Amino acid sequence: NIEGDALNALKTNLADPNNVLQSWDPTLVNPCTWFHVTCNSENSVTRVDLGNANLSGQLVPQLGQLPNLQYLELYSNNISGRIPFELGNLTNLVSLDLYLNRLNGPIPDTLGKLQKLRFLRLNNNSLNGRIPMLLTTVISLQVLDLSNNNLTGPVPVNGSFSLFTPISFANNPLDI
């Protein structure tokens, strides 16, 4: 019921134009039959897929309470807000895709605490800050896309970031 409560909290702080969040009701024993949410055995949420679904609102600081989460996809939406710090508690995240959204703030350093991810896409956003230094600490990352964002500071070209081409990140106030 804790995961259901977290997803209900996410629903409350979000607005649905097409009404793609109606099936979410907390009365059920598990969130497994919920639409756009994928389960695994022993009823734990492992995917949260919402693409071009017109959602508008702000991210929720209770999204990080789903321990067994993977493949979080909230892209192409008018989600206006700041990336929460609680994402650092997702020890099993794989792909975090947030592109063509409108999210402000910096990229948290604690996002690098996730040691097992491979995809991290943040495109066409308006984020104010510099690239976190600790993101070098992950060696499983395969593709990175931080472009068309208010990015400033230096460019890390050591460790894993030493492998990705600079043409991945561009159109920023400061790239050097």
Ligand X SMILES: *[C@@H]1O[C@H](CO)[C@@H](O[C@@H]2O[C@H](CO)[C@@H](O[C@@H]3O[C@H](CO)[C@@H](O)[C@H](O)[C@@H]3O)[C@H](O)[C@H]2NC(C)=O)[C@H](O)[C@H]1NC(C)=O
Question: Applying CB under 6 A, which residues contact ligand X?
Answer: 133, 136, 156, 158-159
How far is Cα 117 from Cα 95, in angstroms, rounded to an integer? 6
Task: List CB contacts of 12: < 8 A, sequence separation 6 or more.
Answer: none
Buried b (16+ CB within 10 A) or exposed e, 57-74: bebbebbbbbeebbebbb
The burial of 9, by beta-carbon neighbours within 10 Å (0-12 exposed, 13-18 middle, 19 or more buried), is given as middle
Among ligand X, ligand NAG, none, the one that 26 touches (CB under a kind-dependent 5 to 8 A) is: none
How far is Cα 35 from Cα 18, in angstroms, rounded to an integer? 14
Which tokens go with 55? Answer: 């959602």
Among ligand NAG, ligand X, none, the one that 133 touches (CB under a kind-dependent 5 to 8 A) is: ligand X
Our finding on whether 58 is near ligand NAG (CB under 6 A) is no
Residue (31 or 112) nearer to ligand X, CB: 112
Among ligand X, ligand NAG, none, the one that 159 touches (CB under a kind-dependent 5 to 8 A) is: ligand X
Contacting ligand NAG within 146-175 (CB under 6 A):
148
Our finding on whether 46 is near ligand NAG (CB under 6 A) is no
Contacting ligand NAG within 112-141 (CB under 6 A):
123-124
Quote the least distance from Cβ 165 to ligand X, whole Å.
Answer: 18
Number of residues written out for the chain: 176
Quote the least distance from Cβ 56 to ligand NAG, whole Å.
Answer: 6
Among ligand NAG, ligand X, none, the one that 89 touches (CB under a kind-dependent 5 to 8 A) is: ligand NAG
How far is Cα 52 from Cα 54, in angstroms, rounded to an integer? 6
Q: What DSSP state is assigned to residue 107?
A: P
Residue (27 or 158) nearer to ligand X, CB: 158
Contact set with ligand NAG (CB under 6 A): 17-18, 52, 54, 64, 78, 85-86, 88-89, 100, 110, 123-124, 148
